[PDB]
Ligand binder design. Structure first.
Ligand SMILES: CCCCCCCCOCCOCCOCCO
Ligand SMILES: CCCCCCCCOCCOCCOCCO
Ligand SMILES: CCCCCCCCOCCOCCOCCO
Ligand SMILES: CCCCCCCCOCCOCCOCCO
Ligand SMILES: CCCCCCCCOCCOCCOCCO
Ligand SMILES: CCCCCCCCOCCOCCOCCO
Ligand SMILES: [Mg+2]
Ligand SMILES: [Mg+2]
Ligand SMILES: [Mg+2]
Ligand code: NA
Ligand code: NA
Ligand code: NA
Lengths: 341, 341, 341
């Protein structure tokens, strides 16, 4: 970001990017992984930190998504939203605490493989308990275990109920945590969270139970110009799904999720990527097992410098044309050009 | 704010804050003063001023509210809006003039008690003629009476008609003004404004008449680490109300409004607050007298520095369970953590 | 704008303005050129550029419109939108390429007369193929013809299909280009673009054909404190129209468009303006010829400096009261005060 202020212990960055982005899929993209057409968007945000005393810092962050693929007519606001808005306090060797809209603690694990040029991170749904950005989350984090164990971190998070007007975007009270260890270029992590479901969620035809659960483990290697990561995750009554045939909606009673990525960064800027993502629903009403996501990725980002890049991301979709939920089976390739600051 | 530009007589500040905020009320908060659940939000704005010559400055300001308690789904924009957008000119000892969306001149008085950690300021409704932020307002202000009387200020404001698609947010043409005097830590102020009502407003079942009127007086003391203030106000056909029982809506034929606040700022950061707010509707159709607001406040803000604070604000709601308009009778307590720049 | 960052070859400007703005027209403005009432708005944007090496720069830009004439109620978002969002690369003497939401290439011509204090530029519709801002546009530009011919520029633009939920805001694939030559204070330009229409567009009662076409030529003189410009343009199946009598909608089978402007900039700040704009629809179903726009403009901007200005813009509307499409026939005058940075 661009440091717009640095005095008296307070630093503030404005940050953002403009992403010229286009998806190419068969026909109207209706049956594809990512869709088709212009997908241009921009981001803007601020990130501030104040040194309160030697041991205490305060911080806050806000981040917004502005779609650049809408007309200036009545659809102008489609897909626009606040991504993050939180504030907190960090006290040396004791931990940090923040509250607001922020990443759910299971993303402490899922973030490991969420590194593809355009796609990937498919199981880190927004407004989905602990796996993505979510509102009303209070998060305690500790780095290097009170300063005693270098590389050992943990987090505990309280998720406050959000009774919204859709089952998809709602949640009940919940709690979760994570622990990670980093060592010589490697990181390993485990995260788990459980929460009440709301009545509206329970009322949906797909998915059954009073609690939602999510956990994931991850390994990454991030050194020597290589980035390699693997996630496994499982969820109960937590992953949102829709049956396009019956026009029903709800949550998968269970999923088993696998994500893999490998990338290499050449000195001259090129960063090729390959990945695999498979999210498998189980015990789905009227169906049993059904794939939600299943693809191989081949892509590349070319970095001109830390402000400018382009990329192509090809998704070789393995979902078949007779997927029992109606999941699209066609490939999608994204091409993007990115200015960021 | 953060000064992002200062050359050739032009200074521009970017400013903002991230407010992690949660309300706690009985049950679903449906019958409470403030509601219940996550209430996180962020603000962003700019404020600019150009020195045109020795005697003339130009200025402009824009300010936005981004809710942080919405999902990234279809409710993403709920409660998002521009709070201020105006530009003006100030000519030494003659006065300033600005036009756009800005505070109505009666807020020159009501601002005195609008100082609680989270709540308070209940009668300074937005889009309500002269008491809060409102669109299309042209405002002339004079400080120290043409430079002749230190501490003596006055304002005159023309309110342009806003025919909106709700009675609640509309207004006709109007005019108002205020005068204030500050002396040795004290301020006293009086403000009055009157405006035409629109046909849509006249058509509502609650409230009757062709003119809306609002006035308020205020005293404050702001010195020696103390802040104490009192407002009295009266309105005619101006305060918006709803009868939850009859599902009718409109404006109170009259209100009488009292707001009191007392705060003390300790050197180490703590700023306790106590307050009282009672807004009383009179001659309401089918009812006569009915309280709209009636509570005692006890709260505190802890300031770490000028960038970081936390607060708790407890509203001891005195509205009774049989309030004839259906006003909520339950208490609400807010807890907030704030980073601002 | 305000340069918020300048290190390592990357420069970023934050920019914006607050425009206090009011329109005055007969009655409710329903039958006027511009409407009536408060029209205050604000703009915010960023514009970045990174020097990648001696010959290569990357850049990005985002720009937003925040209306300041809405209430903070349910109409809060009306007329808010992203105006621009794109990123690109410029390689010395070879050209630049950008993609995202940007000006259609025919605006390379229409921009010449789009210089009035408040109005004007009437044929540069947004989301209208090549004449205004539009989504999904890939644009190649060359300055000084590969460095061989000073003042000679050209552009080629690919317009990607946007199938939106309104005919008005949609378009099919298209291509266009422009060429301009500047010399001794003068500029001349020609621009043309053609694109497929979508099925939804073809389905509208007004307008008939599979292709939309737009072209325009322009001359400007911009020197010696004078600004004078002329545009001529023609369109096929491209200009959006509505018959208020039949409540039908679509596109004009053809238009012929003329825009003229002349302005002079006095040293002390005053910049008077006169203009003429006439857009004439032809072969309109059930009507034949009908004027869409037809007015003379007289106005002035007073510049205090590069940050602060005021203006008045008077539109002498020549549309007659029996216009066969229901186009408003009444005058409109805008008064504005502008702070910008
Ligand atoms: C002390 C550190 C705490 C780390 C807790 C997590 C341990 C597991 O390592 C996760 C490696 O990824 C494995 C992905 O397959 C998952 C199958 O169960
Ligand atoms: C870290 C990730 C490791 C994964 C290895 C990636 C290999 C790329 O996969 C190529 C599979 O092509 C199969 C083509 O099927 C098309 C059927 O319609
Ligand atoms: C020369 C300065 C002009 C000030 C005009 C206002 C005078 C009144 O003082 C306001 C003090 O608050 C009293 C609150 O009770 C109101 C009851 O009427
Ligand atoms: C500047 C303000 C001066 C106001 C003094 C504030 C005193 C705090 O009020 C405490 C009242 O408690 C009454 C409890 O009733 C509960 C009934 O459900
Ligand atoms: C080599 C430079 C290329 C320029 C191509 C455009 C040439 C025409 O000049 C445009 C002057 O405005 C005339 C407006 O009337 C239009 C009537 O046809
Ligand atoms: C560069 C532009 C050159 C155009 C010259 C502008 C002259 C201003 O026009 C004055 C026309 O007034 C006609 C009044 O009709 C009113 C009927 O309701
Ligand atoms: Mg279950
Ligand atoms: Mg009355
Ligand atoms: Mg035709
Ligand atoms: Na169910
Ligand atoms: Na009435
Ligand atoms: Na047609």
């Amino acid at each position: 970001a661009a440091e717009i202020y640095n005095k008296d212990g307070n630093k503030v960055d404005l940050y953002g990017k403009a992403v010229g982005l286009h998806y190419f899929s068969k026909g109207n993209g209706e049956n594809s992984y990512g869709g088709n057409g212009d997908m241009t968007y921009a981001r803007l945000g601020f990130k501030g930190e104040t040194q309160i005393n030697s041991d205490l810092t305060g911080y806050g962050q806000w981040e917004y998504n502005f779609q650049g693929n809408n007309s200036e007519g009545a659809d102008a606001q489609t897909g626009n939203k606040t991504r993050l808005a939180f504030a907190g306090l960090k006290y040396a060797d004791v931990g940090s605490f923040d509250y607001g809209r922020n990443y759910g603690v299971v993303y402490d694990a899922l973030g490991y493989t969420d590194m593809l040029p355009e796609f990937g991170g498919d199981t880190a749904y927004s407004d989905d308990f602990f796996v993505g950005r979510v509102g009303g989350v209070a998060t305690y984090r500790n780095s290097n275990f009170f300063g005693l164990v270098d590389g050992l971190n943990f987090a505990v998070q309280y998720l406050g109920k959000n009774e919204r007007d859709t089952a998809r975007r709602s949640n009940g009270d919940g709690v979760g945590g994570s622990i990670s260890y980093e060592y010589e270029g490697f990181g390993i992590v485990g995260a788990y969270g459980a929460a009440d479901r709301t009545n509206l969620q329970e009322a949906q035809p797909l998915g059954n139970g009073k609690k939602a659960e999510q956990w994931a483990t991850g390994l990454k290697y991030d050194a020597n110009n290589i980035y390699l990561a693997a996630n496994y995750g499982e969820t109960r009554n937590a992953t949102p799904i829709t049956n396009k045939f019956t026009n029903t909606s709800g949550f998968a009673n269970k999923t088993q999720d696998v994500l893999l990525v490998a990338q290499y960064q050449f000195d001259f800027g090129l960063r090729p990527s390959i990945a695999y993502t498979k999210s498998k629903a189980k015990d789905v009403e009227g169906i049993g097992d059904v794939d939600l996501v299943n693809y191989f990725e081949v892509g590349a980002t070319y970095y001109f410098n830390k402000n400018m890049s382009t990329y192509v991301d090809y998704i070789i979709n393995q979902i078949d044309s007779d997927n029992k939920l109606g999941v699209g089976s066609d490939d999608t390739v994204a091409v993007g050009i990115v200015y960021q600051f």
